[PDB]
Design a protein around this motif. Structure first.
Motif, PDB file in Angstrom:
ATOM      1  N   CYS A   1     -11.300  -2.587   0.319  1.00 20.73           N
ATOM      2  CA  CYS A   1     -11.481  -1.251  -0.226  1.00 20.73           C
ATOM      3  C   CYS A   1     -11.273  -1.138  -1.731  1.00 20.73           C
ATOM      4  N   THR A   2     -10.823  -2.196  -2.406  1.00 21.07           N
ATOM      5  CA  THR A   2     -10.413  -2.114  -3.805  1.00 21.07           C
ATOM      6  C   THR A   2     -10.941  -3.351  -4.518  1.00 21.07           C
ATOM      7  N   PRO A   3     -11.354  -3.232  -5.796  1.00 22.09           N
ATOM      8  CA  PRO A   3     -11.748  -4.425  -6.568  1.00 22.09           C
ATOM      9  C   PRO A   3     -10.647  -5.383  -7.019  1.00 22.09           C
ATOM     10  N   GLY A   4      -9.599  -5.574  -6.233  1.00 21.54           N
ATOM     11  CA  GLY A   4      -8.524  -6.478  -6.572  1.00 21.54           C
ATOM     12  C   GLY A   4      -7.254  -5.721  -6.918  1.00 21.54           C
ATOM     13  N   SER A   5      -6.230  -6.518  -7.256  1.00 21.55           N
ATOM     14  CA  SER A   5      -4.870  -6.106  -7.605  1.00 21.55           C
ATOM     15  C   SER A   5      -4.218  -5.275  -6.499  1.00 21.55           C
ATOM     16  N   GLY A   6      -3.213  -4.485  -6.844  1.00 21.13           N
ATOM     17  CA  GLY A   6      -2.489  -3.715  -5.850  1.00 21.13           C
ATOM     18  C   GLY A   6      -1.145  -3.274  -6.378  1.00 21.13           C
ATOM     19  N   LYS A   7      -0.489  -2.416  -5.587  1.00 23.56           N
ATOM     20  CA  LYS A   7       0.811  -1.889  -5.995  1.00 23.56           C
ATOM     21  C   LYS A   7       1.906  -2.946  -5.888  1.00 23.56           C
ATOM     22  N   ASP A   8       1.736  -3.926  -5.006  1.00 26.62           N
ATOM     23  CA  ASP A   8       2.669  -5.031  -4.834  1.00 26.62           C
ATOM     24  C   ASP A   8       1.890  -6.180  -4.208  1.00 26.62           C
ATOM     25  N   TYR A   9       2.614  -7.216  -3.780  1.00 25.01           N
ATOM     26  CA  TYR A   9       2.013  -8.329  -3.050  1.00 25.01           C
ATOM     27  C   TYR A   9       1.424  -7.883  -1.714  1.00 25.01           C
ATOM     28  N   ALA A  10       2.060  -6.911  -1.053  1.00 22.45           N
ATOM     29  CA  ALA A  10       1.541  -6.396   0.210  1.00 22.45           C
ATOM     30  C   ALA A  10       0.308  -5.533  -0.018  1.00 22.45           C
ATOM     31  N   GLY A  11       0.322  -4.730  -1.086  1.00 20.55           N
ATOM     32  CA  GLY A  11      -0.842  -3.938  -1.447  1.00 20.55           C
ATOM     33  C   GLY A  11      -2.027  -4.763  -1.907  1.00 20.55           C
ATOM     34  N   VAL A  12      -1.773  -5.966  -2.436  1.00 22.54           N
ATOM     35  CA  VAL A  12      -2.853  -6.881  -2.813  1.00 22.54           C
ATOM     36  C   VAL A  12      -3.632  -7.331  -1.579  1.00 22.54           C
ATOM     37  N   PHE A  13      -2.916  -7.788  -0.543  1.00 21.98           N
ATOM     38  CA  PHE A  13      -3.562  -8.255   0.684  1.00 21.98           C
ATOM     39  C   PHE A  13      -4.205  -7.114   1.464  1.00 21.98           C
ATOM     40  N   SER A  14      -3.522  -5.966   1.543  1.00 24.39           N
ATOM     41  CA  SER A  14      -4.007  -4.836   2.336  1.00 24.39           C
ATOM     42  C   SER A  14      -5.275  -4.233   1.743  1.00 24.39           C
ATOM     43  N   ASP A  15      -5.340  -4.135   0.416  1.00 19.41           N
ATOM     44  CA  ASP A  15      -6.553  -3.648  -0.228  1.00 19.41           C
ATOM     45  C   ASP A  15      -7.674  -4.680  -0.193  1.00 19.41           C
ATOM     46  N   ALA A  16      -7.337  -5.972  -0.202  1.00 19.72           N
ATOM     47  CA  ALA A  16      -8.370  -7.000  -0.081  1.00 19.72           C
ATOM     48  C   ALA A  16      -8.933  -7.060   1.333  1.00 19.72           C
ATOM     49  N   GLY A  17      -8.095  -6.824   2.337  1.00 18.18           N
ATOM     50  CA  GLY A  17      -8.540  -6.850   3.715  1.00 18.18           C
ATOM     51  C   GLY A  17      -7.819  -7.892   4.543  1.00 18.18           C
ATOM     52  N   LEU A  18      -6.680  -8.366   4.045  1.00 22.63           N
ATOM     53  CA  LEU A  18      -5.939  -9.440   4.686  1.00 22.63           C
ATOM     54  C   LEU A  18      -4.594  -8.959   5.215  1.00 22.63           C
ATOM     55  N   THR A  19      -4.109  -9.660   6.239  1.00 23.02           N
ATOM     56  CA  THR A  19      -2.771  -9.475   6.778  1.00 23.02           C
ATOM     57  C   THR A  19      -1.956 -10.735   6.544  1.00 23.02           C
ATOM     58  N   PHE A  20      -0.681 -10.539   6.253  1.00 21.87           N
ATOM     59  CA  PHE A  20       0.269 -11.616   6.063  1.00 21.87           C
ATOM     60  C   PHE A  20       1.529 -11.243   6.825  1.00 21.87           C
ATOM     61  N   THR A  21       2.209 -12.256   7.354  1.00 25.53           N
ATOM     62  CA  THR A  21       3.504 -12.077   7.999  1.00 25.53           C
ATOM     63  C   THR A  21       4.247 -13.398   7.892  1.00 25.53           C
ATOM     64  N   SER A  22       5.493 -13.346   7.431  1.00 27.79           N
ATOM     65  CA  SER A  22       6.297 -14.535   7.205  1.00 27.79           C
ATOM     66  C   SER A  22       7.459 -14.566   8.188  1.00 27.79           C
ATOM     67  N   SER A  23       8.070 -15.745   8.313  1.00 30.11           N
ATOM     68  CA  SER A  23       9.215 -15.881   9.207  1.00 30.11           C
ATOM     69  C   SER A  23      10.465 -15.256   8.606  1.00 30.11           C
ATOM     70  N   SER A  24      10.541 -15.180   7.273  1.00 34.51           N
ATOM     71  CA  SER A  24      11.674 -14.524   6.628  1.00 34.51           C
ATOM     72  C   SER A  24      11.636 -13.010   6.810  1.00 34.51           C
ATOM     73  N   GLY A  25      10.445 -12.417   6.888  1.00 42.40           N
ATOM     74  CA  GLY A  25      10.351 -11.000   7.181  1.00 42.40           C
ATOM     75  C   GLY A  25       9.336 -10.229   6.357  1.00 42.40           C
TER      76      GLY A  25
END
Lengths: 84, 107
Positions: free
Chosen positions: B67-91
């Motif tokens: 939905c966005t031409p890149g960047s984001g409010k944080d690392y989570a906003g970068v993936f969410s606006d790009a169209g990706l999901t991330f989940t780590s074992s640390s949390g």
């Protein structure tokens, strides 16, 4: 006798070429009968051009109708080879 | 790929009605091609809804989940606006998204 003068041999040569194709015109007009309607349209248009040119003895029409009737004859020959 | 349709003949410009001509088709090996030849006067009456390759890529771009031409409010906003999901074992993980469409701009 005196040999034929200038244009008389040349016009006779053109008439003999046109006479040769007209002998097999009835064969070729027939041969389009088992072929597509384009060939049958083209040869009957081209046939009268050769028929008038021989009896009118006009040099312009006898030149054009010779190469025109040769062109549709090549198209029929390629049609009959491709149709088998 | 690269499908091109051109004339096989190089002379006899404007052929006669009913004349045989050679259609030359260059294209990718193994491909199946479909054809239709239409008078342009149909298109002068109605040229709407003609399909083309540019509209195909336009339909694919309208089906994009980013939905966005890149960047984001944080690392989570970068993936969410790009169209990706991330989940780590640390949390650390992406923001939740329950809507297929993109959020609409204020405009």
């Amino acid at each position: 006798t005196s040999l034929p003068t200038s244009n008389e041999y040349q016009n006779e040569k053109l008439a003999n070429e046109l006479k040769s194709l007209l002998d097999e015109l009835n064969v070729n007009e027939l041969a389009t009968g088992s072929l597509n309607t384009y060939y049958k349209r083209t040869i009957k248009i081209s046939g009268q051009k050769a028929m008038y040119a021989l009896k009118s003895k006009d040099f312009k029409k006898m030149s054009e109708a010779k190469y025109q009737l040769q062109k549709i004859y090549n198209e029929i020959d390629e049609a009959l080879k491709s149709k088998y | 790929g690269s499908l091109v349709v051109k004339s096989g003949q190089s002379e006899d410009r404007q052929p006669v009605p009913g004349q045989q001509m050679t259609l030359k088709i260059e294209g990718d090996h193994g491909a199946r091609v479909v054809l239709v030849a239409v008078d342009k006067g149909v298109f002068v009456l109605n040229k709407k809804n003609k399909l083309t390759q540019s509209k195909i890529w336009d339909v694919v771009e309208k089906a994009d989940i980013g939905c966005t031409p890149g960047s984001g409010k944080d690392y989570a906003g970068v993936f969410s606006d790009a169209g990706l999901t991330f989940t780590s074992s640390s949390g650390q993980q992406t923001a939740q998204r329950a809507e297929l469409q993109c959020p609409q701009p204020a405009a």
